[PDB]
């Protein structure tokens, strides 16, 4: 709302211009951590919210460790997929009639790498997941924290989070395939490098979630 005028000593002639506060408070808000923390906190909150309608079966790890049933496993998977999709775009859905799915039981049946695998033929979209590997992934933590009315455990909230990143990683490949068919998909999943090197078209008002911008290591052995 702020008017300004500028003048030259030799003449009364003056230039007048106004500028608007809003963008500046916007910028500082975006530069303030707690504001940023809101985003991820909301993400986790909303996800748990959707799950609240679920037959949640809270002991998530042991539920996944049951093996006695797969209906809940499949439903969890699918619902997470939908969650990510509706995250990425506000207005999306998938045909709901049936997608009969697979359970993967052993390394001989499992890809070393992306545990979630996608294939299609004759219109039969299909996916598979190694419960063994996922269980082993979930089984280990040692957060000492020596670093620099629902009783939801802080620790298990960790596992509640962790799957999402993997699932999102899968979602990437799903999107690439769905837009470019088998060949481009498999070529890309030969080497994940190509993903962003292609798809700048991802640009959208909301972002991916990996904001803590380093995940790096000693550069020795980088021969």
């Amino acid at each position: 709302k702020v008017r300004t005028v500028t003048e030259i000593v030799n003449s009364d002639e003056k230039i007048q211009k106004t500028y608007e506060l809003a963008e500046f408070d916007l910028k500082n808000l975006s530069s303030l951590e707690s504001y940023e923390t809101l985003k991820i906190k909301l993400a986790l909150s909303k996800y748990m919210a959707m799950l609240s309608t679920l037959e949640m079966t809270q002991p998530l790890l042991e539920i996944f460790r049951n093996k006695a049933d797969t209906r809940q496993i499949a439903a969890v998977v699918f619902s997470t997929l939908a969650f990510i999709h509706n995250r990425f775009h506000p207005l999306v859905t998938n045909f709901t009639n049936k997608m009969e799915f697979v359970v993967t039981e052993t390394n001989d049946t499992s890809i070393p790498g992306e545990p979630i695998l996608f294939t299609e033929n004759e219109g039969v979209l299909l996916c598979s997941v190694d419960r063994p590997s996922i269980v082993k992934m979930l089984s280990r933590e040692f957060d000492t924290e020596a670093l620099v009315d629902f009783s939801i455990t802080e620790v298990e909230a960790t596992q509640y989070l962790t799957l999402l990143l993997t699932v999102e990683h899968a979602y990437l490949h799903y999107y690439i395939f769905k837009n470019y068919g088998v060949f481009e998909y498999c070529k890309s999943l030969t080497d994940h490098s190509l993903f962003t090197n292609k798809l700048r078209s991802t640009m959208s008002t909301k972002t991916s979630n990996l904001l803590l911008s380093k995940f790096k290591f000693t550069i020795e052995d980088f021969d």
Partner: protein
Amino acid sequence: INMRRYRNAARKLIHHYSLNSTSSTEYKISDVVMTMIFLLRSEKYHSLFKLLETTFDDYTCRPQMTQVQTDTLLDAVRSLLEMPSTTIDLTTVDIMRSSFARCFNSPIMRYAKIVLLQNVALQRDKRTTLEELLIERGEKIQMLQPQQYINSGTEIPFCDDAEFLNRLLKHIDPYPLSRMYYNAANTMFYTTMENYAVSNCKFNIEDYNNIFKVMENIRKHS
């Protein structure tokens, strides 16, 4: 003689090696020594101690043991770990033993020569990569129909009361969530890839790094 303290220290070493504890700075030689002393003075564990002794390449001669013995030993192991809640392949432990053989043969000095390598130990493998993997996969996948699906009110569940959610928000509020990523997720993922050592897929960080150049793009697009 504080056997108790010795054990209390010792544990962490094997704990880490077996499974990738998100604790850190485990290393010290004194801890190793006390571990070995405890094992020596633990008759019931002498079998394990004498196996772990075997640390020399030209003489790599881990003895045959009846499944009975092996199971008893694994029981002992788990108990002492106070983690019967799962059991891990003896093969993992023997791989860590080979790692300790590396350490032993390495006169690493003041310089913190962190090995940093993922474990290379394994026997009778063939060199493999994504080529062989893909070739393998197709039949093993297509040979089986997917199990099942049924609808359960599937279509688009949605959000609920914001204040209801704010309850859980406040519950969640204090925690080191910014660190939680390292505190489990990323470490566990990266360590998961010992599957490559299983059947000797030559894992390469050279694409695992791709995450890094990937993450720039959000900042590029502001």
